Amino acid sequence: LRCQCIKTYSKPFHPKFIKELRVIESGPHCANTEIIVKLSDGRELCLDPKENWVQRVVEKFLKRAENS
Amino acid sequence: LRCQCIKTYSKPFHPKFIKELRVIESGPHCANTEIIVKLSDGRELCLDPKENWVQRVVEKFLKRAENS
Numbered sequence: 001l002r003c004q005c006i007k008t009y010s011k012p013f014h015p016k017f018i019k020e021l022r023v024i025e026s027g028p029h030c031a032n033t034e035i036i037v038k039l040s041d042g043r044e045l046c047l048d049p050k051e052n053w054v055q056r057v058v059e060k061f062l063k064r065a066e067n068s
Numbered sequence: 069l070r071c072q073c074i075k076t077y078s079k080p081f082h083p084k085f086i087k088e089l090r091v092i093e094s095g096p097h098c099a100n101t102e103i104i105v106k107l108s109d110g111r112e113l114c115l116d117p118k119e120n121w122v123q124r125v126v127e128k129f130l131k132r133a134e135n136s
Contacts, residue, residue: 018093019092019093019095020090020091020093021090021091022088022089022090023088023089023129023130023133024088025086025087025088025129025132025133025136026133026136027087032136033133033134033136049133049134049135049136050134050135055130055134058130061091061093062091062123062126064093065091065093065094065117066101066118066123068093068100
């Protein structure tokens with residue numbers, strides 16, 4: 001698949017709203033690394049991997065889900 | 069979808085072999101949190117979120133891909 005994100009979500013939010021995370025590294029398919037999250041209600045958003053708050057949300061989600 | 073993993077990969081490997089990561093938190097669909105990686109060659113594996121080496125591989129992959 002080509003790039004999946006048209007734009008990224010720019011307002012911080014709590015990691016409890018994420019139920020699924022997908023990280024696709026850049027490559028021939030898309031010049032950017034893309035982060036796609038599926039929220040508790042099933043909507044999806046793209047996050048900017050460079051933002052510090054995104055990195056923190058990803059990390060928390062993972063710490064949670066890991067011991068789930 | 070129900071649980072996607074029949075079994076997890078138990079031998080440590082280098083994060084350079086991962087090109088995509090999917091983390092699905094447990095819920096009604098599957099009692100376990102599942103970690104599915106797509107390798108550089110397109111094969112997929114499931115990893116055990118509880119293993120320390122998995123957590124370290126996930127973290128490295130993310131640090132890489134983030135500044136990609």
